[PDB]
Write an enzyme that holds these catalytic residues in place. Structure first.
Site, PDB file in Angstrom:
ATOM      1  N   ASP A  62       0.824  -1.212   0.000  1.00  0.00           N
ATOM      2  CA  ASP A  62       0.000   0.000   0.000  1.00  0.00           C
ATOM      3  C   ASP A  62       0.856   1.260   0.000  1.00  0.00           C
ATOM      4  O   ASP A  62       0.377   2.383   0.183  1.00  0.00           O
ATOM      5  CB  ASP A  62      -0.963  -0.045   1.180  1.00  0.00           C
ATOM      6  N   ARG A  80       0.802   6.855  -0.079  1.00  0.00           N
ATOM      7  CA  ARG A  80       0.185   5.835   0.756  1.00  0.00           C
ATOM      8  C   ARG A  80      -1.238   5.643   0.230  1.00  0.00           C
ATOM      9  O   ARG A  80      -1.880   6.674   0.029  1.00  0.00           O
ATOM     10  CB  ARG A  80       0.180   6.250   2.215  1.00  0.00           C
ATOM     11  N   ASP A  91      -5.368  -1.139   4.469  1.00  0.00           N
ATOM     12  CA  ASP A  91      -4.226  -1.704   5.155  1.00  0.00           C
ATOM     13  C   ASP A  91      -3.820  -3.056   4.577  1.00  0.00           C
ATOM     14  O   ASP A  91      -4.577  -4.018   4.740  1.00  0.00           O
ATOM     15  CB  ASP A  91      -4.513  -1.932   6.643  1.00  0.00           C
ATOM     16  N   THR A  92      -2.658  -3.148   3.943  1.00  0.00           N
ATOM     17  CA  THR A  92      -2.195  -4.447   3.466  1.00  0.00           C
ATOM     18  C   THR A  92      -1.290  -5.041   4.532  1.00  0.00           C
ATOM     19  O   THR A  92      -0.702  -4.297   5.313  1.00  0.00           O
ATOM     20  CB  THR A  92      -1.427  -4.384   2.142  1.00  0.00           C
ATOM     21  N   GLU A 135       2.037  -6.353   6.237  1.00  0.00           N
ATOM     22  CA  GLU A 135       3.362  -5.788   6.250  1.00  0.00           C
ATOM     23  C   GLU A 135       4.438  -6.789   5.856  1.00  0.00           C
ATOM     24  O   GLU A 135       4.355  -7.943   6.270  1.00  0.00           O
ATOM     25  CB  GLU A 135       3.673  -5.294   7.670  1.00  0.00           C
ATOM     26  N   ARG A 175       3.832  11.662   3.109  1.00  0.00           N
ATOM     27  CA  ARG A 175       3.350  10.830   2.002  1.00  0.00           C
ATOM     28  C   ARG A 175       2.046  11.342   1.410  1.00  0.00           C
ATOM     29  O   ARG A 175       1.106  11.719   2.109  1.00  0.00           O
ATOM     30  CB  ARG A 175       3.180   9.398   2.508  1.00  0.00           C
TER      31      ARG A 175
END
Length: 136
Positions: free
Chosen positions: A16, A30, A35-36, A38, A82
């Site tokens: 992401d 971002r 939320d992907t 990690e 970001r």
């Protein structure tokens, strides 16, 4: 109203977070509302589906003819500098694709940056019902 702008891929960093050329400048972006898992983690290590979410995003962006960025109506940058946006690959939103495939959860949402929250929530429930990846 939200409008798309052109951008050029530099490098996908992970599921992401991506580096793109935006109006002449290299920046880190971002992906809004998702939320992907990690791959680069301090405490824990590669989370499960991390490598997968990140190959997905990489392939989708690298294969596209055209990349576009869509700012929402709130802050356009986060505290790390970001960009905050919806990213499109040949007209397909990377953020929703990730969620539809069970490779991302809808993030905690901050109004007013929440214009595609419902759609996204729609796709996550479907990936849930189909028990894909994350949801398996």
């Amino acid at each position: 109203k939200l409008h798309k702008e052109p951008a050029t891929l530099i490098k996908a960093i992970d599921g992401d977070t991506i580096k793109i050329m935006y109006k002449g400048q290299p920046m880190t972006f971002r992906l809004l509302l998702v939320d992907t898992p990690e791959t680069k983690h301090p405490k824990k290590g590669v989370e499960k589906y991390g490598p997968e979410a990140s190959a997905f995003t990489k392939k989708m962006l690298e294969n596209a003819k055209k990349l576009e960025v869509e700012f929402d109506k709130g802050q356009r940058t986060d505290k790390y500098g970001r960009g905050l946006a919806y990213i499109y690959a040949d007209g397909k939103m990377v953020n929703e694709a990730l969620v539809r495939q069970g490779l991302a959860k809808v993030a905690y949402v901050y109004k007013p940056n929440n214009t595609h929250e419902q759609h996204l929530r729609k796709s996550e429930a479907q990936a849930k019902k189909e028990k894909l990846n994350i949801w398996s």
